[PDB]
């Protein structure tokens, strides 16, 4: 039997869940029949991107409708759709393609939850919870309910969560401190750096396996920069309410996880409107997408030396920008280590 805990046992058994990883696939129109979960490959993902920044080029530059076509159909023949009694649409769209290219983002990572799932598991001697947590190389303990850690990450969850969002609670089910293997490591040379935050990031459950062995990572050579608001970053949130947004629940499927990382910012470089950045200016560090409301900068708190924006949603002096709540990206997968996991229980109102 597994020598885990129990709440470390229910939460491998729900990462590595392959109904979750089949009901993700079902979302993005995949044909399972066609595209099982065992044909996935990173070679046939990689040729994906290629294929959606070729046909991204093609609609913005206005090349010919018989090119746009052609790489639909390649498209497709490389991932089947299930579009059932409908057309298939064009890939001639931007939102559509846009829509594509985070389909294969998770594509990645539940590729590597499957391979990791079918590994090296033939050891008797070892509860299969436990094997495949060892899969993780993240060593994963239980924070205590009631210590001080626990009590400001609950504040940094209620005072955050935003007036629009408002269409469900948030109830912190468990609270795990994750510390993956070699992370602390290559995130080092950043401790030199300033404004280093506690930020949140969400994420599918079936994209956690993918998420806690390689860590966060920025999207491959392939993708499309035009993909990403703001480019091929790692982006993060100050409110528990937009990063949640990204855990995809609903009413039939409640618990979500979130992630809160520490994130070496820097000098950040402010943007009020999406930008597909490429190159960061000299002496800047991140990028801050600013947002009309965001944590009272009065509330900010310390945790070991990282600032924790726990602060509520209070209305920020800045009008003229796109954005409702405030964005961070990174640019090199050195500059977050990785904190907690959060098992999140989504109360919706009915
Ligand atoms: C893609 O834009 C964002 C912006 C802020 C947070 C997150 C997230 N997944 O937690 C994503």
């Given at each position: 039997?597994?020598?885990?805990?129990?709440?470390?046992?229910?939460?491998?058994?729900?990462?590595?869940?392959?109904?979750?990883?089949?009901?993700?696939?079902?979302?993005?129109?995949?044909?399972?029949?066609?595209?099982?979960?065992?044909?996935?490959?990173?070679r046939?993902?990689?040729?994906?991107?290629?294929?959606?920044?070729?046909?991204?080029?093609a609609?913005?530059?206005?090349?010919?409708?018989?090119?746009?076509?052609?790489?639909?159909?390649?498209?497709?023949?490389?991932?089947?759709?299930?579009?059932?009694?409908?057309?298939?649409?064009?890939?001639?769209?931007?939102?559509?393609?846009?829509?594509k290219?985070?389909?294969?983002?998770?594509?990645?990572?539940?590729?590597?939850?499957?391979?990791?799932?079918?590994?090296?598991?033939?050891?008797?001697?070892?509860?299969?919870?436990?094997?495949?947590?060892e899969?993780?190389?993240?060593?994963?303990?239980?924070?205590?309910?009631?210590?001080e850690?626990?009590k400001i990450?609950k504040?940094?969850?209620?005072?955050?969560?935003?007036?629009?969002?408002?269409?469900?609670?948030?109830?912190?089910?468990?609270?795990?401190?994750?510390?993956?293997?070699?992370?602390?490591?290559?995130?080092?040379?950043?401790?030199?750096?300033?404004?280093?935050?506690?930020?949140?990031?969400?994420?599918?459950?079936?994209?956690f396996?993918?998420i806690?062995?390689?860590?966060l990572?920025?999207?491959?050579?392939?993708?499309?920069?035009?993909?990403?608001?703001?480019?091929?970053?790692?982006?993060?949130?100050?409110?528990?309410?937009?990063?949640?947004?990204?855990?995809?629940?609903?009413?039939?499927?409640?618990?979500?996880?979130?992630?809160?990382?520490?994130?070496?910012?820097?000098?950040?470089?402010?943007?009020?409107?999406?930008?597909?950045?490429?190159?960061?200016?000299?002496?800047?560090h991140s990028?801050?997408?600013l947002?009309?409301?965001?944590?009272?900068?009065?509330?900010?708190?310390?945790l070991d030396?990282?600032?924790?924006p726990?602060?509520?949603?209070?209305?920020?002096?800045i009008?003229?920008?796109?954005?409702?709540?405030?964005?961070?990206?990174?640019?090199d997968?050195a500059?977050?280590?990785?904190?907690?996991?959060?098992?999140?229980?989504?109360?919706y109102?009915?």
């Amino acid at each position: 039997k597994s020598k885990l805990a129990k709440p470390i046992q229910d939460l491998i058994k729900m990462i590595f869940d392959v109904e979750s990883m089949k009901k993700a696939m079902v979302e993005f129109e995949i044909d399972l029949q066609k595209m099982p979960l065992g044909k996935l490959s990173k070679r046939q993902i990689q040729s994906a991107y290629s294929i959606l920044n070729e046909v991204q080029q093609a609609v913005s530059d206005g090349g010919s409708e018989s090119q746009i076509l052609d790489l639909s159909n390649r498209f497709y023949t490389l991932i089947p759709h299930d579009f059932g009694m409908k057309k298939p649409p064009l890939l001639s769209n931007l939102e559509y393609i846009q829509a594509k290219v985070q389909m294969l983002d998770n594509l990645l990572d539940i590729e590597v939850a499957y391979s990791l799932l079918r590994g090296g598991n033939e050891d008797g001697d070892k509860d299969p919870i436990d094997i495949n947590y060892e899969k993780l190389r993240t060593d994963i303990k239980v924070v205590d309910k009631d210590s001080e850690e626990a009590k400001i990450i609950k504040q940094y969850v209620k005072n955050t969560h935003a007036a629009t969002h408002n269409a469900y609670d948030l109830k912190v089910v468990e609270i795990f401190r994750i510390e993956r293997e070699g992370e602390s490591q290559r995130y080092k040379p950043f401790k030199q750096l300033h404004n280093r935050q506690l930020l949140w990031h969400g994420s599918r459950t079936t994209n956690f396996a993918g998420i806690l062995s390689q860590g966060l990572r920025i999207a491959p050579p392939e993708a499309p920069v035009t993909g990403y608001m703001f480019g091929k970053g790692i982006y993060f949130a100050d409110m528990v309410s937009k990063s949640a947004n990204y855990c995809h629940t609903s009413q039939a499927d409640p618990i979500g996880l979130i992630l809160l990382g520490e994130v070496a910012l820097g000098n950040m470089y402010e943007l009020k409107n999406a930008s597909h950045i490429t190159k960061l200016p000299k002496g800047k560090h991140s990028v801050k997408g600013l947002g009309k409301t965001a944590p009272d900068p009065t509330a900010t708190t310390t945790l070991d030396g990282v600032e924790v924006p726990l602060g509520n949603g209070i209305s920020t002096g800045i009008n003229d920008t796109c954005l409702l709540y405030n964005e961070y990206i990174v640019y090199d997968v050195a500059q977050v280590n990785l904190k907690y996991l959060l098992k999140l229980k989504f109360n919706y109102k009915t």
